C-alpha cells in the first residue's frame, strides 16, 4: 500500500564515511578495508581547481599532506595512488565496519541511493536515477563532494556513484568508484553543459503500473499501439525508445495488473499528446521517470 | 524544484530493529537498552485480530511466550507489560547499539523518516508527514507493523511513530512510542475510515519562503492580513488554521527573506482565491505541503 521514493537503509555506508583534507581543501571519502577513496579534486588549491594538471599536482604530494579523519580519530596515510578521478589513500588501519561490497558502473535509467555527507558526516539519504545524459538530479550542498551512491542486495553494498560537482543548471555529475565520469564531464572548476536530456520511458511505464496497483486508472484507455508506433511518438516528445527488453522487464507488472504493456503504451501516448488536464498521478502533476520496474515491483508486489 | 524528500541516515535506528513473534503472529520491535517496544497486536491470533480483548490476551501470556530475535539471535524476555497500544518486553541484554534517544509525540504537519522493516530486517527509508487527519501517506507492505518513524537532531534520535495498520484508502495509522494512537483509531482489524484531510498551511508557507529564497517571488503581493482573518479564509479552502507555534516556527524563514509571516499569509490567500493563472512556483503548479520550515532550512542551508 502506497508508493514513495524509497532509499536503501544507509547504515552500512554511514560507517564508511570519513573526511579528507589537503591543505585547506576538504571533502568526503569512503573507507573500505585499509583504503580511503575520494575525489582527486581534494589535491587542488583554489587556484589549481580552475585548471588542474592532476599528475603534476599529485607527484608533488607526500603522504603527510593528507589528513584523514574518521569521526575525530585521525587515520595515518601510508601510501597514495590515483585511479582516473579517484584518489586512493592507503591507511594504516582497516575499517572494522567495512561491509561486503562491490564497485559497479550503472546504466542510464537505473536508480540508486545517495548518502549526502558533509565534512565526513552523513546528513541525508534519498533515491536518484542516472539520467540518459549521465547527470543526476540530486540534492547536494557545498561540501558534499565525495558523497556516494549505492544499492544493497542481501548484505552486499554495490557502490556505483561518487559525487564530484554541480553543473550550472543545478544537476550533478560524478564518477564510478573506478574514477571514470558518467558523461562527458571533467573534474575542473569550469562551466560544463550536459547533452540534451531525455525521459526514461520504461520507468514512466513502471510508475503508471504503480499508479494502477495503488488504485488509480483514470489515464487508461481502450486504444492500443504497436511498439514502433509508440516509439515514433515517444521520440517526438524526447522520450527514450522502448525496447523489447524493456517490454519483457515490465512483464511482471503487466501480469499483476492485467494491462498489456502495449496498452499502457497507448495510455502514455495519450498523456503525451493531451497532457494531464490538471489531474495528478500518484500525487504528481508530471510524468515521473525515476522509478525502475524493479523499484515498483519491490514496493507493489502483492 | 530542486527540493525533494530527504530522509535522515537510518543507521542509528537499523541497529535497534528486532523481530517479535507470539505463536505465528510476527512483527517488528524496537530494542532500546534492555527493553523491546512493539505493537501489542502481536499477542493476537488470527481469530483475535478482529475483536481483541487485550487484557485477557495478556494475562494468558508469560515471558516465555514471546520470541524476540535480533537476526536469528534470540533475546530472552524477562518481563512484559502493556502501555496503551504498545507492549514493552524487558530483555536480558542491553542493546550495545542504543543511540541517545527520546520519545516524542508530533503534531500534524511535522515530517519524519520511516525505516520500513520486515521480519526485523530494515528494508527502506523515506520521509513522510503526519497529515491533519492523523494518517501518513507511507509505503508499507504486509509485515511492516512495528516499523518506526523518527527524526535525528545532534546524535539524538527522537522516535515519533510506530506503524500499526493500513486503512481502507491505503493510508497508514500508528501510535507514538507510548502506544497512543495518532487520530481516532484503535488496534483491531476493523475497517476504520480516515476523516477528510486538509492542506498543511504552515508547510505551504515554508514552501513559499523556499521559493523566495531561490528568487521565485512573483506571488508576493502588496497586502497584509491578520492571523485571525487569514485563518477564517484558509478554512474555506480546506487549509488548516495556523497556530501561534506555526507563526514562530516560520520566524527564521521570515527573517532570512525579510518577508513578514502575515505578508506571506496574504500572498497565500491571493493564490487560494485567484489561483496561479497558469504560472508555477519552484517549477510546480501544485503547492507542496509536506516540507516543514525545518526541512526548507535543511535543504537550502
Ligand atoms: C552546491 N554543490 C552541489 N554539489 C556540490 C559539490 N561540490 C563541492 O562539494 N565542492 C566543490 N569544490 C570544492 C570547494 C572547496 C573549498 N574547500 C575549502 N574545500 C573544497 C572542496 C571542494 Cl571539492 N565543488 C566544485 C567542484 C568539485 C569537483 F570535484 C570538481 F572536479 C570541480 C568542481 F568545480 C562541488 O561541486 N556543491
Ligand atoms: C499492507 N500493509 C500496510 N501496512 C501494513 C501493516 N500491517 C501489518 O504488517 N500486519 C497486520 N496484521 C498482521 C498480520 C499477521 C500475520 N502474521 C503471521 N503475523 C501478523 C502480524 C500482523 Cl500485525 N496489519 C493489520 C493490523 C495491524 C494492527 F497492528 C492492527 F492493530 C490492526 C490491523 F488490522 C497491518 O496493518 N500492512
Curated annotation (Swiss-Prot), chain B:
Active site (record annotation): 41, 145
Regulation: Inhibited by pyridone-containing alpha-ketoamides compounds 13a and 13b. In turn, alpha-ketoamide 13b (tert-butyl (1-((S)-1-(((S)-4-(benzylamino)-3,4-dioxo-1-((S)-2-oxopyrrolidin-3-yl)butan-2-yl)amino)-3-cyclopropyl-1-oxopropan-2-yl)-2-oxo-1,2-dihydropyridin-3-yl)carbamate) inhibits SARS-CoV-2 replication in human lung cells. Inhibited ex vivo by michael acceptor inhibitor N3. Inhibited ex vivo by compound 11a and 11b.
Numbered residues of crosslink Glycyl lysine isopeptide (Lys-Gly) (interchain with G-Cter in ubiquitin): 5, 90
Cellular compartment(s): Host cytoplasm; Host Golgi apparatus; Host nucleus
Consequence recorded when altering residue 145 to A: Complete loss of 3C-like proteinase nsp5 cleavage
Peptidase C30 domain boundaries: 1-301
Cytoplasmic side: 1-301
Reactions this protein catalyses: TSAVLQ-|-SGFRK-NH2 and SGVTFQ-|-GKFKK the two peptides corresponding to the two self-cleavage sites of the SARS 3C-like proteinase are the two most reactive peptide substrates. The enzyme exhibits a strong preference for substrates containing Gln at P1 position and Leu at P2 position
Quaternary structure annotation from Swiss-Prot or TrEMBL: 3CL-PRO exists as monomer and homodimer. Only the homodimer shows catalytic activity. Interacts with host FBXO22; this interaction promotes the proteasomal degradation of nsp5.
Function: Cleaves the C-terminus of replicase polyprotein at 11 sites. Recognizes substrates containing the core sequence [ILMVF]-Q-|-[SGACN]. Cleaves and inactivates human TRMT1, preventing tRNA guanine(26)-dimethylation of tRNAs. May cleave human NLRP1 in lung epithelial cells, thereby activating the NLRP1 inflammasome pathway. May cleave human GSDMD, triggering alternative GSDME-mediated epithelial cell death upon activation of the NLRP1 inflammasome, which may enhance the release interleukins 1B, 6, 16 and 18. Also able to bind an ADP-ribose-1''-phosphate (ADRP).
Protein's UniProt name: 3C-like proteinase nsp5
Amino acid at each position: 500500500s502506497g508508493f514513495r521514493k524509497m532509499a536503501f537503509p544507509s547504515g552500512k555506508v554511514e560507517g564508511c564515511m570519513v573526511q579528507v583534507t589537503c591543505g585547506t581543501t576538504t571533502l568526503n571519502g569512503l573507507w573500505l578495508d585499509d583504503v580511503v577513496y575520494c575525489p582527486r579534486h581534494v589535491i587542488c588549491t583554489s587556484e589549481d581547481m580552475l585548471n588542474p594538471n592532476y599528475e603534476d599536482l599529485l607527484i608533488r604530494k607526500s603522504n603527510h599532506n593528507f589528513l584523514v579523519q574518521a569521526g575525530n580519530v585521525q587515520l595515518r596515510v601510508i601510501g597514495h595512488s590515483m585511479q582516473n578521478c579517484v584518489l586512493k589513500l592507503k591507511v594504516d588501519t582497516a575499517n572494522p565496519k567495512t561491509p561486503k561490497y562491490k564497485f559497479v558502473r550503472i546504466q542510464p535509467g537505473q536508480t540508486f541511493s545517495v548518502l549526502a555527507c558533509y565534512n565526513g558526516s552523513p546528513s541525508g539519504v534519498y533515491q536518484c536515477a542516472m539520467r540518459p545524459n549521465f547527470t543526476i538530479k540530486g540534492s547536494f550542498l557545498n561540501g558534499s563532494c565525495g558523497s556516494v551512491g549505492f544499492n544493497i542486495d542481501y548484505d552486499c553494498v554495490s557502490f556505483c556513484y561518487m559525487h564530484h560537482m554541480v553543473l550550472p543548471t543545478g544537476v550533478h555529475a560524478g564518477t564510478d568508484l573506478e574514477g571514470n565520469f558518467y558523461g562527458p564531464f571533467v573534474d575542473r572548476q569550469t562551466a560544463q553543459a550536459a547533452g540534451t536530456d531525455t525521459t526514461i520511458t520504461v520507468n514512466v511505464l513502471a510508475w503508471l503500473y504503480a499508479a494502477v496497483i495503488n488504485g488509480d486508472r483514470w489515464f487508461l484507455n481502450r486504444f492500443t499501439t504497436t511498439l514502433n508506433d509508440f516509439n515514433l511518438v515517444a521520440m517526438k516528445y524526447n522520450y527514450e525508445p522502448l525496447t523489447q527488453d524493456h517490454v519483457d522487464i515490465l512483464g511482471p507488472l503487466s501480469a499483476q495488473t492485467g494491462i498489456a504493456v502495449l496498452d499502457m503504451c497507448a495510455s502514455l501516448k495519450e498523456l503525451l499528446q493531451n497532457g494531464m488536464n490538471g489531474r495528478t498521478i500518484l500525487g504528481s502533476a508530471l510524468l515521473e521517470d525515476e522509478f525502475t520496474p524493479f523499484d515498483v515491483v519491490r514496493q507493489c508486489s502483492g
